Ligand binder design. Sequence first.
Ligand SMILES: Cn1cc(NC(=O)c2cc(C(=O)c3c(Cl)ccc(Cl)c3F)c[nH]2)cn1
Length: 340
Amino acid sequence: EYEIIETIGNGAYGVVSSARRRLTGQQVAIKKIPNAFDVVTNAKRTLRELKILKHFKHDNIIAIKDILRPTVPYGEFKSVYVVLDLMESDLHQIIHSSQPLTLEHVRYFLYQLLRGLKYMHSAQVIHRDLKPSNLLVNENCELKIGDFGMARGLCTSPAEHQYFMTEYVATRWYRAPELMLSLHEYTQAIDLWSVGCIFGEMLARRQLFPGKNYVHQLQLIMMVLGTPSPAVIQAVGAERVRAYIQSLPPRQPVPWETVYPGADRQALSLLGRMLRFEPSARISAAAALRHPFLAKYHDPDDEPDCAPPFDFAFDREALTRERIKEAIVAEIEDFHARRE
Ligand SMILES: Cn1cc(NC(=O)c2cc(C(=O)c3c(Cl)ccc(Cl)c3F)c[nH]2)cn1
């Protein structure tokens, strides 16, 4: 049914290969999740991502094109094969390379990212791990958000460690203040912090806050944003961090013009609207698409919401590996039923 071209990916998620459907000739990416059901944690993530990707139909979100059916007896179905959009590169590789990236690239890439988040956010899904390398880009310059392993809804299970240990959620360099400090306000605004970090990175083609560890991360952020306000300092979850921040002299925010000298005025306008300490002070995805910097591409008339919202209830459930296997197989059957 498929003709393998070459291998490209490894690992943590599995193995990725480029391929073509024999009948159509159309090119795809095939991900093998080997021994998919052997570990509960992994199996749970697999089910969560299968449901998420099947839920979205959006040009700026990686899509499942096919899932191969077991052609073996059920008991020997060990590894899962997912067929996905083939994407040549990603935003990290592009930013950190000798490829072009003018203001127009920045503008268009940001536009698509935000377009994808408006959709995803409206379904009540926080990605929680946006970074350049999770944003794939194909030969046509389409940007697609992938890697939904970290994604959660607005109210989650206290049985997960992450519920309390927010400072370990996602990736340090793009991790929102509210996660670092446990500000007890966990919304889609988490993503808009990461977007700001990505935006900044694209403007200078280097990482905005590359802290070596926890404390240095906070220091790097505060070098630009200044010290958090009193109101935020009070809201800090743990005593020692709270105390640490209070131990520093007040610092005034640096205007973005200084951080990124000579950069587009309209770009820094929007950037500033995203990188603020307080979650609810940050611009939303939907509103950022309205900002003058994205004038050129914004079309209210082609930036859909996602109905209905995604429900994360299934993830809360306590299932054995063998039940998770069934649930995943049901999703493969459902995929094909819904088509054929
Ligand atoms: C450099 N290069 C990468 C490819 N592969 C693709 O086309 C491709 C990747 C995806 C993903 O959902 C995805 C995966 Cl599988 C692993 C990790 C992350 Cl972060 C992802 F986003 C979908 N298609 C080919 N070359």
